Amino acid sequence: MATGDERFYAEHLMPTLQGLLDPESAHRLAVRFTSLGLLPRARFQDSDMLEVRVLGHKFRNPVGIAAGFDKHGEAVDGLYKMGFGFVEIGSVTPKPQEGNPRPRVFRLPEDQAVINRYGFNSHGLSVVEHRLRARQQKQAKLTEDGLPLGVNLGKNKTSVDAAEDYAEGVRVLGPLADYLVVNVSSPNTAGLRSLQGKAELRRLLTKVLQERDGLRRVHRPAVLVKIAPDLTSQDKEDIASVVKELGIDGLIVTNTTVSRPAGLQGALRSETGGLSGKPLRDLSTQTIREMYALTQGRVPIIGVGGVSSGQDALEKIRAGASLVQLYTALTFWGPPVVGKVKRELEALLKEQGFGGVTDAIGADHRR
Ligand SMILES: Cc1cc2nc3c(=O)[nH]c(=O)nc-3n(C[C@H](O)[C@H](O)[C@H](O)COP(=O)(O)O)c2cc1C
Numbered sequence: 537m538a539t540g541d542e543r544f545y546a547e548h549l550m551p552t553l554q555g556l557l558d559p560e561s562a563h564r565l566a567v568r569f570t571s572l573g574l575l576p577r578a579r580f581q582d583s584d585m586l587e588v589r590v591l592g593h594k595f596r597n598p599v600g601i602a603a604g605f606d607k608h609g610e611a612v613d614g615l616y617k618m619g620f621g622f623v624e625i626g627s628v629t630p631k632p633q634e635g636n637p638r639p640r641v642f643r644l645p646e647d648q649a650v651i652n653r654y655g656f657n658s659h660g661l662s663v664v665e666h667r668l669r670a671r672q673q674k675q676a677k678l679t680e681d682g683l684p685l686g687v688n689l690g691k692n693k694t695s696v697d698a699a700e701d702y703a704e705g706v707r708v709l710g711p712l713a714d715y716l717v718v719n720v721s722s723p724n725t726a727g728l729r730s731l732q733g734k735a736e737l738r739r740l741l742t743k744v745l746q747e748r749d750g751l752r753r754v755h756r757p758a759v760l761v762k763i764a765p766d767l768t769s770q771d772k773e774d775i776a777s778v779v780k781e782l783g784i785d786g787l788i789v790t791n792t793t794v795s796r797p798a799g800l801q802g803a804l805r806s807e808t809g810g811l812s813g814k815p816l817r818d819l820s821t822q823t824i825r826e827m828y829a830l831t832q833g834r835v836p837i838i839g840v841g842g843v844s845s846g847q848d849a850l851e852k853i854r855a856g857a858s859l860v861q862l863y864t865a866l867t868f869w870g871p872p873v874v875g876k877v878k879r880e881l882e883a884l885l886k887e888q889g890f891g892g893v894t895d896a897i898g899a900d901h902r903r
Pocket residue numbers: 602603604605607626627641650652654656688719762790791792812813814816840841842843861862863864865
């Protein structure tokens with residue numbers, strides 16, 4: 537049973553490594569091991585119940601790795617090996633940039649949470665382009681086999697024209713991606729989340745979509761917008777409106793939160809940055825629920841924020857997500873968490889009378 541690796545990781549290896557390594561070192565080591573395929577056995581075999589068709593693609597299972605883990609596209613193949621149904625790399629900025637000073641990442645173990653203020657540390661588009669080009673046909677085969685690749689695009693700290701930074705990303709990495717994400721929801725770049733005062737969001741996304749439409753057909757990715765959990769009701773209404781009007785392909789709901797929910801215990805709760813993990817979970821699920829309603833269920837949503845179990849995944853799917861991602865849970869529980877979530881989700885689907893993931897998408901809105 538896989539529960540062996542799961543328990544060993546969760547109860548012994550992971551807490552040991554947490555005591556030995558600072559969180560940024562732990563991130564770097566996890567990326568390096570993953571990149572080399574040095575992974576526990578992923579004992580879980582994906583069943584047909586977990587397959588999802590969305591965004592022009594087959595997804596063998598609906599559990600992805602969220603942006604921010606493999607920022608620079610170094611570990612994509614090991615992430616599939618780990619059992620993820622899809623991988624999102626980035627955020628990638630046009631020019632290389634260092635990000636914020638260290639320390640810039642903090643664990644809140646008591647809360648099963650993380651706070652980060654990386655500030656879009658990125659190798660930049662050219663480096664990532666060449667890295668993805670080196671495995672482009674391997675990725676075409678993976679995609680055809682139900683294992684798509686997403687690329688999350690960011691902007692540089694000193695850029696004078698945000699829309700131009702995103703357009704550069706679409707031109708350079710769009711041809712190498714199944715989907716692109718216009719991340720206008722980092723907490724850690726000044727001005728970024730403001731990329732929604734309405735006619736200006738419309739202006740940005742129109743430029744992005746024009747650049748995407750200009751790519752040759754087999755190199756033309758889906759375009760998604762990733763939003764924060766901190767938006768006003770007005771901002772959410774506005775985003776829904778623009779997405780419908782422009783024919784944006786989907787939404788990623790959500791990025792980290794700049795809020796600090798009552799009840800956090802970790803000593804580092806008042807560090808600046810975005811909060812992820814358990815305390816974000818229900819805020820994210822509620823944002824999914826509202827965006828699904830505002831878009832009439834016609835816009836695919838990738839649900840993200842605090843997923844650590846099959847129940848967490850199913851709640852997001854029933855709220856409206858077609859796919860989910862996780863990050864922070866991997867940091868606490870290690871690679872076995874991926875099989876755990878998938879096994880649990882399959883069991884819950886059966887118990888609740890769903891034929892598969894597809895049948896559960898948005899199920900709460902139909903009761
Ligand atoms: C250390 C860290 C770095 C991240 N960097 C990125 C990023 O570069 N781009 C992005 O869109 N989201 C970034 N995120 C946000 C995650 O993609 C995700 O939306 C969020 O952490 C919620 O999921 P989780 O609770 O499962 O971690 C980052 C998250 C963490 C924890």
